[model samples]
Target: THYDVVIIGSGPAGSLCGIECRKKGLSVLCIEKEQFPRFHIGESLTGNAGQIIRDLGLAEDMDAAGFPDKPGVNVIGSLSKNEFFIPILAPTWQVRRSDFDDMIKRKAVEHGVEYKLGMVTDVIKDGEKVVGALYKAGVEHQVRSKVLVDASGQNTFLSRKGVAGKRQIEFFSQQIASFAHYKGVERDLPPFSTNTTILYSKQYHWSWIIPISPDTDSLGVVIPKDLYYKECKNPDDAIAWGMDHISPELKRRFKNAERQGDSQSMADFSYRIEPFVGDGWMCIGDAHRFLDPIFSYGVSFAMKEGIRAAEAIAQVVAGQDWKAPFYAYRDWSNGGQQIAADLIRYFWIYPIFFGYQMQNPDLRDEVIRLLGGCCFDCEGWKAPAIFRNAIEEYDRKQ
Candidate 1:
């Protein structure tokens, strides 16, 4: 098939698809703009991603690489005394992203995927169908493939080229997020101190405390866009503004957490684009769409869809009917995002979710499943039942 697939971006999406498709005997080539071990955000993961890591036979490699193990997620409310802990069904990582990404790239290469260090400048169009891309390796070069996989993070190269358009999605938080790495950031107590702690400074104003190692953890803070621009001078203000006027709890957690570098800020990070499958291509991972990291489900969803896309790609290469299979995958992929988008927003807006969980110990397992990221199957997973009842029951009293 003259290389069945040409993938863009060597991140989780691309590397995983490359590995999986290669396993199916498809000739795959992946092009990336950056070299290995580069810095990026999104360190925490869910059990879904952990399952794939084991399936790819990287369990031992994950251990050797020293990515901190993430046991679960903890939700802490500000002013309210409600706390919720959701343990993962399996082992996952609180990755130091640079190393974690680099390791996955290496695995793809090991599986015989042709890895190229080059920038994809343009998408080559054949009518409304994408046939190839104008790659800039040393100079502009036209590279063609039977199938194109756009795993290009937020660059969203294919979507930019009009292969798809943004679908309507509810925007959550409406914030300009700022975050940074830290040293000696302490874990707060109860069920998980060393796990992913979602610290709610306010309903929509929140932060993540993820432990990457025993001595080092990652901390990121997000705030409203208008307030961020109007008041805040730097990322430091995102965490305990005016250090001397800090709270005892805040001080105890971040007192010694030295910032490793300058924090990064993004104005917005929400999107939706449909028709993940096209005439001869598929969009997997962040290249397709992204919602807020409400449950740290970003990487898991990416890795999951990446695998499914690879399987579909192989089937297509084997001369199977394409359209039906791809649409099926796309539907499933979008379903997961829909759940995350709703769950993220609801958790922030509805205090009933947390209140109900605290009052009804019987609902623990149900909520935990939703929090664990099986939520996309909301109806069947019992997430919606518990979530709806939590809101309706508590909302009625309020």
Candidate 2:
């Protein structure tokens, strides 16, 4: 009941990490609480993420599923009635998470990652090094491992267990996301038809229309907590309220639409757990941090972290010391997340300037590239430096 690598939560991060662990010839066992094909929120994928999926040999499966090919994002200042498109330099998809996540998990399994259905109750530590986990399915059980990886998404499994430190204060703390899939929603023509559309109606409130298929769109509305408590009764009511009052465009798009299934909601979701790695364990994806979902970075970031974590773990298993690899992953992952946080802050704090940059021929392409979300290579990106300078100047002025 021992493994070379044991991953908790078989989502994208865990699954991809498992696949890579096996690629490095490390035995892997992934424990998961939920079954495959379960409903999940975060459905959008950046073009960079699509490339990662393609590398995993799922290009054919993605095409077979007929997920929408997203070209870019169209941002609308609903009250100002201004809009611009952030073009994706590469191809991407707007997926149904249930199908998309299941496909990756299946691929990991095909690559020889052992999968288990269970909830991890606690970590098994030896001299402050997390060596394994205690989990339960039918009865209590324990398994040993050389390394432990947490990809528990928003559950923040290790953090909740107090093994990982407490979550940091969120930048956007009072936010709630209510979303669902719908049919017959109005869409842009041809090329832009599949673009993820963002309708900004309030200072901290907005709506999204993302095409997941030719005939269905994922509709979502995000609002502050005070507004959620005062204005809406439930998530469904929140969606209706957003359409009815926030934006005329949102209402018009849904005029002929019919809800395809049940809706989902997430609140106060932005957080980060510092020191995401320990002696024999590390946190990845939403388990370690999650910024605002403005740019659809969740899945892509998760997969990328998974791959990095696996590489680090493989090095430790191959006789290299853990400190360099583990600490390097933490610094590298946090660097990208900080860039995304700064970029989102820039957009919200200076909307007019942001829109102007969108139109600036000199800055437009760079801005579009920044919007693609995976900033893991932040040091190599010129746009992040440009925006960071603006942010630093603005913050000091305030």
Candidate 3:
């Protein structure tokens, strides 16, 4: 079968890209290896995600999902016993990944995207250009497309086929994360409460608690890979070790909570693909890069890249020279990846500058805006200069 565009994987990146491409009147085919409503990680959404949802015309559907409304975030520390409340003045929602991802895939179908359930085994290339892909469902199927999009999240289906390789940023090593859902946990609500919380400890690791919905919350701990092994002998013991090492307050709150699902772990979670695009193929979402979840910008970054990729694909379908558009998308994606790395590195700095901003109201507001995901464009950083200066001053004071 012939198609204008072929997208691999139906996660937030792939599905959204398919929907956008379909809207542009392209014959788009999206294939997913997993079934809908499948369990996945990265449940929390930053405020800026709302904008992307609205752009895709899924705002109402997202609201109907009954996900938790994340008003802001609270960063807690054990050594200083400080709490930094960063309000997400803009709208944001905490999503259950399974339900949220399925909703997006359905939206793609609504936009006239053809859906297939299969795993793509190989990419067909003509010299420097990608021609199509070989997929296997119950049987082998070969499909042809002018453009191939790799949104296979961490799998890097096409990239791993020698089309691309991973890029490393020095001083930013991979971290391990183990998280699960829980129920019956007491949570403080509104103006003072947020769906997201980041807790830093002197123990060389930090914990994140993100409320995915009214009834369940997603909790995880991120630590250096070496430190993770030094702290626990096995996966089962990791949770217990996390609970024991966390602050007394978190332990108290989790004491009555019951684990709602199995815990999952991941390693080497921070890296970007060197070349995210070729003549006829491009990479999106975790398929190209994944940064630390410190700023909670994963979903937003993925959605934005998906949209950009769709636009580039549209140009190619129209028989226009799409290199410039594709290059523009690459630049945008690389910028976001770098920002994430910088923010994650900044978090590891001594004394934790985020909390110190609380003492200065101006700096606090700026930090709040950034945390809210309003600071994506360079202008977003402009409004935060005061806060940045304050953070520098605080560092000097220390």
Best by lDDT: 2
TM-score of each: 0.90, 0.96, 0.90
Off by over 4 Å in 3: 167-172, 191-194, 358-366, 374-376, 379-398
Give lDDT tens digits, candidate 1, residues 182-215.
Answer: 8877666644666887766565666777887666
In angstroms, the error of model 1 at 51 is 1.6
Between prediction 2 and prediction 3, the one with superior lDDT is 2
Off by over 4 Å in 2: 171-173
Q: Model 2 over residues 1-398: C-alpha lDDT tens digits?
A: 99999999988889889998999999999999999888888878887888888888888788789798888888888777777778885777889888998999999999999988999999988888888899999899999988889999989999999888899866554688898999999888886788898888767788888888768899999988888888884789899888887789987888889998788777845788977898888999999898778778888889989999998999898887789999989988988888887888788777767887777775787666656765776556566887788889987998
lDDT of each: 0.75, 0.85, 0.76
- The TM-score of predicted model 2 comes to 0.96
Between prediction 1 and prediction 3, the one with superior lDDT is 3
Kindly report which residue pairs in candidate 1 clash with one another: none
Off by over 4 Å in 1: 167-172, 188-193, 240-248, 358-363, 375-379, 385-398
Kindly provide the TM-score of model 1 when superposed on the true structure, using C-alpha atoms: 0.90
